[PDB]
């Protein structure tokens, strides 16, 4: 998606990405939605840029904690996250 509904849906996740319990079920719905939105090639580019703008901007943040989000609610992503991994320009 054009770096927008993703931006909205990550917010409930940010609590945990930054440092917290959960995240909430809303984020889990957000997770399957991110996986579903991030599928066309454009989408990977837009989501990746959204990320390189948002969380990279919020440097005080814990990507490796976020790693645990998918193996918890029960879902996976085409790639994890471009803070300590890569933009995944598929």
Ligand X SMILES: CCCCC[C@@H](O)/C=C/C1=C(C/C=C\CCCC(=O)O)C(=O)CC1
> Which chain residues interact with ligand X by CB under 6 A?
6, 10, 13, 17, 30-31, 34-35, 38, 44, 47, 50-51, 54-55, 66, 69-70, 77-79, 81
Q: Are 49 and 88 in contact (CB under 8 A)?
A: no
What three-state secondary structure class fits 83? Answer: coil
Nearer to ligand X, 20 or 78 (CB): 78
Q: How far apart are CB 60 and ligand X at their closest, in Å?
A: 14
Residue 68 main-chain phi, psi, to 5 deg: -65, -15
Q: How far apart are CB 44 and ligand X at their closest, in Å?
A: 6
């Amino acid at each position: 998606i054009d770096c927008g509904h993703v931006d909205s849906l990550v917010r409930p996740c940010l609590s945990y990405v930054q440092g917290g319990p959960g995240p909430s079920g809303q984020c889990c719905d957000g997770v399957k939605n991110l996986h579903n939105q991030a599928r066309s090639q454009s989408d990977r580019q837009s989501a990746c840029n959204c990320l390189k703008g948002i969380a990279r901007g919020i440097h005080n943040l814990n990507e490796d904690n976020a790693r645990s989000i998918p193996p918890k609610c029960g879902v996976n992503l085409p790639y994890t996250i471009s803070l300590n991994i890569d933009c995944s320009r598929v």
